[PDB]
């Protein structure tokens, strides 16, 4: 038993997006399908449901004007189209099934479809050193890192010394800046004495903009 | 709409300990002795999983240590003894009428001894300063509990509205948190002041810790 | 525990605008069960019309189909309000156990004309 959803979407405001949820014959003859979304950092919000046996629908009134729900019986696939996209439509969208006999809970969820809505266009990161010094030295420990700034969309991936350096690393979750672009920091703590005996390089990959940058971080 | 209020927002417990979570509805979600209330688990980067349906029924496949209770407006989810796998976010959901709604979620985190942050500060890179923008970064490393206050001061003036922070997930090795805060100014504003400080308050510290530097040091 | 519900009359005849009422009988102290009222689809699937208690989150719910619990608690009226031409067909009710989660037992089927 599977619910398999379509992949990541990046959209402009005013655009449309159509998310798919592939199920099985059994699911379609024995369950209703529901759509739920989750904005970043927030909880779950119900959008609507559909009865695959007759195409009948229900809705959270908030979404009724912009959401269309359909099923394709012949491919046992459910579709959610969200039109006239807004900035705060940015969320993970889930399809979920519910027993058609009675609500015994959403007993199976699809893996989720990430949708980002923004007037921002695809942009590669500017990578800046977070340079170790006496102001980043506590005891016999020093901290250093990289500032990965002003990219779009998510995600960026960061490694240190080509993946060799893993212990003592923290790569923080990105924040969305007022500009609409993301920024993130990645830091590592090392013995302060090692600042003059070790080379530290952060490897940044941003696949949407084809960006691969290495940045040597010096004291 | 019927609104579900979960409490507490965060439970800090150790493995083996009982966890009791609460869900309260703004109106009754029970009819004819049936309670239209369900419970779900969610881990980072994962879809929710159903634990309990119709207030008190255990979903097949779900371990016996999970149980649900309640009716009307008052519901609880209990984990009789926490396993390491059970530290996650838990939601309740009703279907007493439309719209279906979810509670705000309860996070069950690992309890550990208080750990004070080590505080580090990073001046803007010269490279960035060429771009007409200046980012100052404050890092709080490996602390517990998660609650920490970070305040930015520029020439002793408290900054508001020009910083953002991010916090890691609880470390799988030592159960601590780390926090990054970024102060962002135009290069022109940055060059108009001398001293940049981040002031950190945390219950593991005997007094607030101030890390600062002189621009151009 | 437990037997399938009964569903009567075997043959129900009306023509337009009438009300067609079946009776589902389920002797129980629930022990939570729920009831479903089904009509047979053209592909011989059991299409759910309504439940007891009411399935308020059923999408595409049709309010012409009503299920009412009678005072003895064992008998339920399953009724089509203002029955139409295409409402003619095969009907039945089912009792569903919530605890084994899966378990349904269906009644014998009936005809409405």
Numbering used by the authors:
A (entry chain A): 2 to 220
B (entry chain B): 1 to 217
C (entry chain Z): 31 to 143
Please give sentences taken from the publication describing this entry.
As the exact epitope and mechanism are crucial elements for antibody drugs, we report the crystal structures of checkpoint molecules in complex with the Fab fragments of therapeutic antibodies approved by the FDA or currently undergoing clinical trials, and reveal the binding modes of the complexes and the conformational changes induced by the antibody binding, thereby providing a structural basis of checkpoint blockade by monoclonal antibodies for the treatment of cancer. In summary, the elucidation of the crystal structures of the checkpoint molecules PD-1, PD-L1 and CTLA-4 in complex with the Fab fragments of therapeutic antibodies sheds light on the molecular mechanisms underlying the therapeutic activity of these monoclonal antibodies. Monoclonal antibodies blocking immune checkpoints have demonstrated unprecedented therapeutic benefits in clinical trials and provided a major breakthrough in oncology.
The FDA approved pembrolizumab for the treatment of advanced melanoma in September 2014 and metastatic non-small-cell lung cancer (NSCLC) in October 2015. The PD-1/pembrolizumab Fab fragment complex was crystallized and its structure was determined and refined to a resolution of 2.0 Å. The formation of hydrogen bonds between PD-1 and pembrolizumab involves side chain atoms of PD1N66, PD1T76, PD1K78, PD1S87 and PD1K131 and main chain atoms of PD1F63, PD1E84, PD1S87, PD1G90 and PD1A132, whereas a salt bridge is formed between PD1D85 and heavyR99.
